[PDB]
Amino acid sequence: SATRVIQKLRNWASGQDLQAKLQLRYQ
Amino acid sequence: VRPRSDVTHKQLSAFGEYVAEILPKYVQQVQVSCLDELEICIHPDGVIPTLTFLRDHTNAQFKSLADLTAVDVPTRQNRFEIVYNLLSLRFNSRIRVKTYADELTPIDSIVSVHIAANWYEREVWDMFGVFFFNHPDLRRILTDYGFEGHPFRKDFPLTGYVELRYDDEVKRVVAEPVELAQEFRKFDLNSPWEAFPA
Amino acid sequence: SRAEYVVTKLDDLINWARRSSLWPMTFGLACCAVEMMHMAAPRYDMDRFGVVFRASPRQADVMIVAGTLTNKMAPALRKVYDQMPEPRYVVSMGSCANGGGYYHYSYSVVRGCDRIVPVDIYVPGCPPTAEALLYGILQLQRKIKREQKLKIWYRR
Amino acid sequence: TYKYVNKKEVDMKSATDNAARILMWTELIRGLGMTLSYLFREPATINYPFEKGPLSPRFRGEHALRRYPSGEERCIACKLCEAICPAQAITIEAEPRADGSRRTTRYDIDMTKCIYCGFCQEACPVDAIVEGPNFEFSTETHEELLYNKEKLLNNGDKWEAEIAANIQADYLYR
Amino acid sequence: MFFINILTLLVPILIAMAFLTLVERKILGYMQLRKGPNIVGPYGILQPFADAMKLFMKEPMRPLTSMSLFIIAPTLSLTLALSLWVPLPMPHPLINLNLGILFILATSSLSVYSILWSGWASNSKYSLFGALRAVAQTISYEVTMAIILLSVLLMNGSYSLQTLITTQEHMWLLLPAWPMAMMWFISTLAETNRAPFDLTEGESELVGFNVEYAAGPFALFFMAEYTNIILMNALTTIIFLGPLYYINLPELYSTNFMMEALLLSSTFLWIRASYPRFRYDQLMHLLWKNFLPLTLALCMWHISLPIFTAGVPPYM
Amino acid sequence: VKQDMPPPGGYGPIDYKRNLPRRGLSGYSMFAVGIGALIFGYW
Amino acid sequence: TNMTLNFGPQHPAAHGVLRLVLELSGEMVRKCDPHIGLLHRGTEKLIEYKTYLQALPYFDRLDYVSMMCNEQAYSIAVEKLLNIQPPPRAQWIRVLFGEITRILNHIMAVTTHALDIGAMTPFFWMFEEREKMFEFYERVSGARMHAAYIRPGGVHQDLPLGLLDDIYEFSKNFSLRIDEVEEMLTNNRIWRNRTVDIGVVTAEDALNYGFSGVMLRGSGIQWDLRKTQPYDVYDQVEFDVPIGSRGDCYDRYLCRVEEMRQSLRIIEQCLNKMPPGEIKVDDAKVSPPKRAEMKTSMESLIHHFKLYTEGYQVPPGATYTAIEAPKGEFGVYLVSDGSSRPYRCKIKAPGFAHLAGLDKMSKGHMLADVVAIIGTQDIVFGEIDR
Amino acid sequence: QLITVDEKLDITTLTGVPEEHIKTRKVRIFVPARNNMQ
Amino acid sequence: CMTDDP
Amino acid sequence: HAVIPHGKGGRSSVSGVVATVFGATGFLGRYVVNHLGRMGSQVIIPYRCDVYDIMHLRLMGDLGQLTFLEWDARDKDSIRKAVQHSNVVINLIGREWETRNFDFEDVFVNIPRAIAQASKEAGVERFIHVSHLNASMKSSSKSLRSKAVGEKEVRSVFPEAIIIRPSDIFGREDRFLNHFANYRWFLAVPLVSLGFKTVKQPVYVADVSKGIVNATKDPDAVGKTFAFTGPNRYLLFHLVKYIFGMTHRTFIPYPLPLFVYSWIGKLFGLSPFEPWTTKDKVERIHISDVMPTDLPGLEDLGVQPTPLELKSIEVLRRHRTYRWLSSEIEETKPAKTVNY
Numbered sequence A: 001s002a003t004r005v006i007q008k009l010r011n012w013a014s015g016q017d018l019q020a021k022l023q024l025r026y027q
Numbered sequence B: 001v002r003p004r005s006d007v008t009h010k011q012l013s014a015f016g017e018y019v020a021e022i023l024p025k026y027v028q029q030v031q032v033s034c035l036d037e038l039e040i041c042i043h044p045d046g047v048i049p050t051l052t053f054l055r056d057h058t059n060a061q062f063k064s065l066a067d068l069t070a071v072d073v074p075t076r077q078n079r080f081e082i083v084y085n086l087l088s089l090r091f092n093s094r095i096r097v098k099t100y101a102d103e104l105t106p107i108d109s110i111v112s113v114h115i116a117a118n119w120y121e122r123e124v125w126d127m128f129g130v131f132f133f134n135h136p137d138l139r140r141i142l143t144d145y146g147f148e149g150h151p152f153r154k155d156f157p158l159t160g161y162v163e164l165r166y167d168d169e170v171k172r173v174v175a176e177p178v179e180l181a182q183e184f185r186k187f188d189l190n191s192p193w194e195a196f197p198a
Numbered sequence C: 001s002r003a004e005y006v007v008t009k010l011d012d013l014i015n016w017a018r019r020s021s022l023w024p025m026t027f028g029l030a031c032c033a034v035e036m037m038h039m040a041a042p043r044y045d046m047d048r049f050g051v052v053f054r055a056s057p058r059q060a061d062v063m064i065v066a067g068t069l070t071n072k073m074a075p076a077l078r079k080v081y082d083q084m085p086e087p088r089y090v091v092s093m094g095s096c097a098n099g100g101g102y103y104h105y106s107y108s109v110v111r112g113c114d115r116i117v118p119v120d121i122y123v124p125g126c127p128p129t130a131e132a133l134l135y136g137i138l139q140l141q142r143k144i145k146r147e148q149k150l151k152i153w154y155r156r
Numbered sequence D: 001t002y003k004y005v006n007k008k009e010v011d012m013k014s015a016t017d018n019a020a021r022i023l024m025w026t027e028l029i030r031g032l033g034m035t036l037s038y039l040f041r042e043p044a045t046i047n048y049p050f051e052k053g054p055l056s057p058r059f060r061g062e063h064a065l066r067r068y069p070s071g072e073e074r075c076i077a078c079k080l081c082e083a084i085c086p087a088q089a090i091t092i093e094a095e096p097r098a099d100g101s102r103r104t105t106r107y108d109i110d111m112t113k114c115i116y117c118g119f120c121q122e123a124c125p126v127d128a129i130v131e132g133p134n135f136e137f138s139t140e141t142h143e144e145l146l147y148n149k150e151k152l153l154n155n156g157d158k159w160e161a162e163i164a165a166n167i168q169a170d171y172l173y174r
Numbered sequence E: 001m002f003f004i005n006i007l008t009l010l011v012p013i014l015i016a017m018a019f020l021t022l023v024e025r026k027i028l029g030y031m032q033l034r035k036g037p038n039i040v041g042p043y044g045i046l047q048p049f050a051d052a053m054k055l056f057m058k059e060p061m062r063p064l065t066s067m068s069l070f071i072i073a074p075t076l077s078l079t080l081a082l083s084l085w086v087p088l089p090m091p092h093p094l095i096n097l098n099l100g101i102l103f104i105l106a107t108s109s110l111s112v113y114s115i116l117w118s119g120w121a122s123n124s125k126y127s128l129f130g131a132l133r134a135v136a137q138t139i140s141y142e143v144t145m146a147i148i149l150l151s152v153l154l155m156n157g158s159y160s161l162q163t164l165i166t167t168q169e170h171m172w173l174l175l176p177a178w179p180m181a182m183m184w185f186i187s188t189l190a191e192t193n194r195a196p197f198d199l200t201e202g203e204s205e206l207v208g209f210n211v212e213y214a215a216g217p218f219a220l221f222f223m224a225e226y227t228n229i230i231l232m233n234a235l236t237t238i239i240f241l242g243p244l245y246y247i248n249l250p251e252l253y254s255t256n257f258m259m260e261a262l263l264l265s266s267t268f269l270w271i272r273a274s275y276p277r278f279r280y281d282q283l284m285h286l287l288w289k290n291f292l293p294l295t296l297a298l299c300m301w302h303i304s305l306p307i308f309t310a311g312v313p314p315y316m
Numbered sequence F: 001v002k003q004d005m006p007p008p009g010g011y012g013p014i015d016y017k018r019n020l021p022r023r024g025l026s027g028y029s030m031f032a033v034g035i036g037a038l039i040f041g042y043w
Numbered sequence G: 001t002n003m004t005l006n007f008g009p010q011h012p013a014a015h016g017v018l019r020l021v022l023e024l025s026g027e028m029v030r031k032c033d034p035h036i037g038l039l040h041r042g043t044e045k046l047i048e049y050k051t052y053l054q055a056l057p058y059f060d061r062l063d064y065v066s067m068m069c070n071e072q073a074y075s076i077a078v079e080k081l082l083n084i085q086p087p088p089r090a091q092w093i094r095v096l097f098g099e100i101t102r103i104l105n106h107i108m109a110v111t112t113h114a115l116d117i118g119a120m121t122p123f124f125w126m127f128e129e130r131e132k133m134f135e136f137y138e139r140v141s142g143a144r145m146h147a148a149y150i151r152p153g154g155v156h157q158d159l160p161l162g163l164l165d166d167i168y169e170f171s172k173n174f175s176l177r178i179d180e181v182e183e184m185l186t187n188n189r190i191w192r193n194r195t196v197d198i199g200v201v202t203a204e205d206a207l208n209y210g211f212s213g214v215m216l217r218g219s220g221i222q223w224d225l226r227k228t229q230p231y232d233v234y235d236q237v238e239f240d241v242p243i244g245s246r247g248d249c250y251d252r253y254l255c256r257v258e259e260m261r262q263s264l265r266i267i268e269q270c271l272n273k274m275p276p277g278e279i280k281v282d283d284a285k286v287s288p289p290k291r292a293e294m295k296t297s298m299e300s301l302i303h304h305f306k307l308y309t310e311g312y313q314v315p316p317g318a319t320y321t322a323i324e325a326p327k328g329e330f331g332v333y334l335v336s337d338g339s340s341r342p343y344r345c346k347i348k349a350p351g352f353a354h355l356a357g358l359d360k361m362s363k364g365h366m367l368a369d370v371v372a373i374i375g376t377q378d379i380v381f382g383e384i385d386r
Numbered sequence H: 001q002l003i004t005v006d007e008k009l010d011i012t013t014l015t016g017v018p019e020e021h022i023k024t025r026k027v028r029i030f031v032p033a034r035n036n037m038q
Numbered sequence I: 001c002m003t004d005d006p
Numbered sequence J: 001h002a003v004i005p006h007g008k009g010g011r012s013s014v015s016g017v018v019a020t021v022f023g024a025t026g027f028l029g030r031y032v033v034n035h036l037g038r039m040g041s042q043v044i045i046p047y048r049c050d051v052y053d054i055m056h057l058r059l060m061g062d063l064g065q066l067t068f069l070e071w072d073a074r075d076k077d078s079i080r081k082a083v084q085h086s087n088v089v090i091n092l093i094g095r096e097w098e099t100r101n102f103d104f105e106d107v108f109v110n111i112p113r114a115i116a117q118a119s120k121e122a123g124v125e126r127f128i129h130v131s132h133l134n135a136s137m138k139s140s141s142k143s144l145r146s147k148a149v150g151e152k153e154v155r156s157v158f159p160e161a162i163i164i165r166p167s168d169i170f171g172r173e174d175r176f177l178n179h180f181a182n183y184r185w186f187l188a189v190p191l192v193s194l195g196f197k198t199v200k201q202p203v204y205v206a207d208v209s210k211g212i213v214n215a216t217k218d219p220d221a222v223g224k225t226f227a228f229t230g231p232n233r234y235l236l237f238h239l240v241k242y243i244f245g246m247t248h249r250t251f252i253p254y255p256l257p258l259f260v261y262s263w264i265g266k267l268f269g270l271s272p273f274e275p276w277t278t279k280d281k282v283e284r285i286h287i288s289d290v291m292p293t294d295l296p297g298l299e300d301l302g303v304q305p306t307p308l309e310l311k312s313i314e315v316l317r318r319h320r321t322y323r324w325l326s327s328e329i330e331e332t333k334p335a336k337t338v339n340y
């Protein structure tokens, strides 16, 4: 649950997809 | 039932004779017990010689000292039973060499054979009181700096004889004879009926 | 204007400042330290509540004794308790430090830290849960809130 | 099967590549990117008073003594909860209640002595002593932590509804 | 008026100085997956004021130590740091000094004493060992710090910080002289004992002059460090990143000065969380081996660039 | 009575290898942009 | 005294409690004499006065970063003495939670190492993952740490109905979390410096001082007791020991990050191949009877009463059983008379040997080097002090 | 070579026991009887 | 979250 | 009503003395609770100071030995419940600075009366009342005279109530010894009559405490007015210098009329926060110690007095400097004893 732009800043800065392995566990 | 592999029981037994022949002089009893572990029992004088042969023999390289411990059988004249457990990364096996030492009859130190023992030997002196000659620096390791008595001896009270509290009058921590507020309840647990040995 | 009122309000401020920012000096004797590092960690952030991750024996408002206080470490605990500021507090953590714990009857374990340092909140549990420590730190905050130092000065 | 974690030409391309790594701190900038990335991730912390970290039914938490629905306390003083306690925490002395039944005159769990093993939960035949869910029982004074039968029975009455639900969920497993 | 202009330029900085600790305890937090302090006040805004009050109330224990080299040290640390904001040239400065950068270099240099005095005053081993190493890297870093400025000045024409607003009316001095910016930034990180270079407060290493310092003395240096953290970042934002200046509206200079200073102040916060601390000798190995030869040579290039490019800067 | 066991057919596959990406501007290209910046600045 | 300076017991840098009386000529360490026993508590003597099942909780406390792996060592030891072996499902469980525990230890060792070095963000990143793991412990044992789940005859209670699935979701992702730490430390231009070529230990010297752990593996000696002497069902899994060369703080680190990786490979398998079955031996003689059975069958009550009140009554003998605890070789020498309570239980602590090496590792080193080396030995004073 | 000592090994001086509990404590050596119960 | 039933 | 004494004698043992001690937070008090707690006695410590300050007393008492009750001197009910279940009441209520809301009468005579009064209503076996030594109903210092007034009254509220009457006390955290040592801040150390003709006999705090405690557990003391005094007397001159001697700080005894000096005491007395010197204190300081002709205290009650020089090193150590902090008493010269 984070805007794709902000999310992108994350993926770019990281260099891999955190979306696939998130810190927020969900149902 | 454990998955015993007789293949081992035999090979280790055979080594036990091998060592017994190689060092007839110090080996008193050698026995590969069930659980497939070999224990060569040596006269206390054979501490240096038996270890060295195991650390430096092509057919028995026992490079690292897993542990040095001393059970205390008070009944036994020689109270302590120093046990040295050794591993062999080359033959992937383990052997235990155990000797007997009384309170005031010291054992030699093997810090020369394995420097691992520098600390464990200090541990055995602090807890049981056995002394190790030729030790580089034998001094209490685990007990308090002023502790009197060797703690793991079976004749030492669990709670001990001294406990510490802070006293305002003297503004410093101060020992006092132990006064416990609920003594250790000593449940008797042994059953009066034995189990017919298999 | 009644100074009495003026005093209470002032005290409260003082209490709010100490209670909002408690910089804990933790010892980590034993394991209950691992359960405090968890508090400092992200699920249960200690900082959010104003508790700093850690500080030296000086700048520390509260000492959390986690773990067995063995007879050799007993002289030290005291030293460090004695080396802290005038407004200081002790949160015993762990059955090993509240009383003696699994090692109460041992010869090398002090049966409680409250025999060596006065203790204000006792947090129970062998690994007292991190939430429980957090509950304990929060109860220290309610203990401080109630303290009324200047009103006793005024009424003394 | 083994693996070599760190077991190991000079070309302008290579060197120029390596020199740039030292001169403009390229790898250091890589590390900064990682932390900037999380700055944008949702924080994992929970409002502690408002939201609570999840504990499932077996959580041992705080000791309680249960009672039969009817209202008769479950404990029948067999005293093996005392026998198996590792820390010597539970002290039990008993005498036949006038009813003729067997009940504990004094049941004292010293919580500071207790290391919350949960064996007492295990050992009880009537399952009178249970590890209750509550973990928040921090106390200002050491004496409050020592618990007699009345506190534990009172603890049992307060948390009986959840204790019953928790035992309900985990008894098939035991 | 001038007095009012002293409140402004001081208080405002002190209030901002307080809000940096907060933006440090939250930016480090979110980077480490944690909210940071939000429970006291709204979003943690009252958090800096809260521990200030706790720090001043707690006993300033005077060790069983000097009593002056102990109280002079924090006073000096806060006095020099707040003082160095006097000549800073936001839009137009408070006290314009013709030899302004020498004032900033000299005032910084004096702060090394506070570390030396506090370490001797404590009279405990951790303090003295920490002070001697701390003094060593501070002055070691001062040597490259000064040469890096001399290269700048020679392309600015004067020591007055006000001239750079006219030097940087077309391009930042980062484009030219970027190689030194980096070396000014790393030196700014050392001189504020911030993370990559913070063995002084090294905790695992020497838990160090601040060790015996608690309550009010702790706070004053403390305040000093953070104000410095800003000041040095602000000097980066005037000397190398030149904010756009329009003579008609002076505040867009200060608005951009505000933006660049906050971002570079944010950067050393970000550096801290991101990097492990360097070894004591690894730190000096960098300055004397890695940076000083680069700086001295690039210093000569900045005496040559002017002459043969017929660009000798206009004095005044 | 049911026992928590791996789902039928087994679980999916996990990564046990570092996926660190070797991504960077080539060194020459890196230096050239920088030197070009200084040349423009000097002019 | 060459300015002898106690590293001091209270020091964030010193794990727990370590007085390192060090004589340092300025910033160089001439000799390190670590002091121990600041956490001696009597664990070895106390056990003699307790029954086998009531001494199981002591093992979790011996080195509590690695809570369970330690239990497995006592379990195995008590099972050998009884010549009983656990049921097939229990074995896989112990390997499942055995590995999860290894990760937990390495996340502590790598991240706590960095906190002393000065990197603080890796600790918060991975303590969140740790937290998630603890929850596995809690939902299996009841306690976040100090579970008491692995008992001498198998585990205590079957996994909750649903845990395996979650030990998957986590495992499926944890890798990226290790990957991140990496992008932060493995190649940091600065981690390497403070770690590389610090505390190099030769191969012959490592065996001689009894290092027996990553410390040996880091020097290039290939020894994983889990492959050389398989215990439980670590034989049926397939993993690669991460051997190292140019053994130094950096190399061993890389090894610990690699076993975090290899343990995810072992965990995956355990989830993929855990058998249907019972989780405790069926010998009411050794394992306590199920509560439905003890409440309906007389032989089960008698066996429940005797087991809890008196004990296993292990046959007389002595054994040294060593596993590969995350720190290194953890072994219990358990001498036993026919009685229900043990006679001796020397715990070999991977750590008593490692600390001793501090002297032979940190020679001619700076104060900061000593901090780095205590980290590369994963010293948990509980196991050393016992 | 061995040395001769006729002194009953007394090691009271090494055991580390407080003086009061070595001179005022009488110990009885007995074979335990059987609880008539079993 | 001991029970997912309010 | 009693508690058979069982145990070996240390903490976690029982002695059977349940005792309210109203002014325990005090310098003397701290010590009284120490022995009472060491012995294993039940100690009820009434307190009106904040809980943070009362914490130091918690640790010397064993679990359940110490009970703390909220109490207000003006409120009679608070004293009532404190002595409800005590069988021994010890009164150490005293101050040197007449506070805004409490006068010397209150702290010495008014309050200590109400207290013993209730104690009787309660049926406490014995009450120990503490009043300063040489306390004439006509003594100059209002304090001493007022204290004298009290020892009389309390008799009538509580007959056969022991009345120990200690001299100024010597102990760490005491005033007698620290006050003089703290004159360092003052460049010159005024001494009326240049510190002469006011011979003084200090008494170690513990001796006083042990004595007091022994009273609680001895039938011989009833209506007794013991006087714990000391092991050696001293002209104030040697005392002052000696102190400065151990403190290793220079000494400049300066004569200053007590007339003018009573005024200096007034000045500090004016200060709101615990005046450091008190017009009365000044007078008391000069009031010469009286010779002993009364019920013997120490020794008589079972403790042999402890010479000042013996423990002085511990009390005055904090006042030394960086190096002086390492000097010991026997290399130092012990001052002469003037019995006069």
Ligand SMILES: NC(=O)C1=CN([C@@H]2O[C@H](COP(=O)(O)OP(=O)(O)OC[C@H]3O[C@@H](n4cnc5c(N)ncnc54)[C@H](OP(=O)(O)O)[C@@H]3O)[C@@H](O)[C@H]2O)C=CC1
Pocket: C156, J022, J023, J024, J025, J026, J027, J028, J029, J048, J049, J073, J092, J093, J094, J095, J096, J102, J106, J107, J130, J131, J132, J133, J165, J166, J167, J168, J169, J170, J174, J175, J176
């Ligand atoms: N050297 C000495 O001090 C000597 C003392 N004495 C007598 O012995 C007694 C004990 O001496 P010391 O301990 O030094 O005295 P302190 O000055 O230490 O005071 C003793 C206690 O009385 C309490 N107190 C004071 N005023 C009041 C009040 N208005 N209401 C309730 N409680 C009060 C104080 O508690 P709080 O501070 O918390 O209010 C304090 O804990 C004194 O009464 C004194 O007259 C006699 C000879 C020498």
Ligand code: SF4
Pocket: C030, C031, C032, C066, C067, C068, C093, C094, C095, C096, C097, C101, C102, C125, C126, C127, C128, D115, G061, G064, G146
């Ligand atoms: S209390 Fe339980 S957890 Fe805390 S230290 Fe003692 S044993 Fe480890």
Ligand code: SF4
Pocket: D074, D075, D076, D077, D078, D079, D080, D081, D082, D092, D123, D124, D125, D126, D127, D128, D129
């Ligand atoms: S076991 Fe259950 S029932 Fe038997 S005594 Fe302990 S609690 Fe009461």
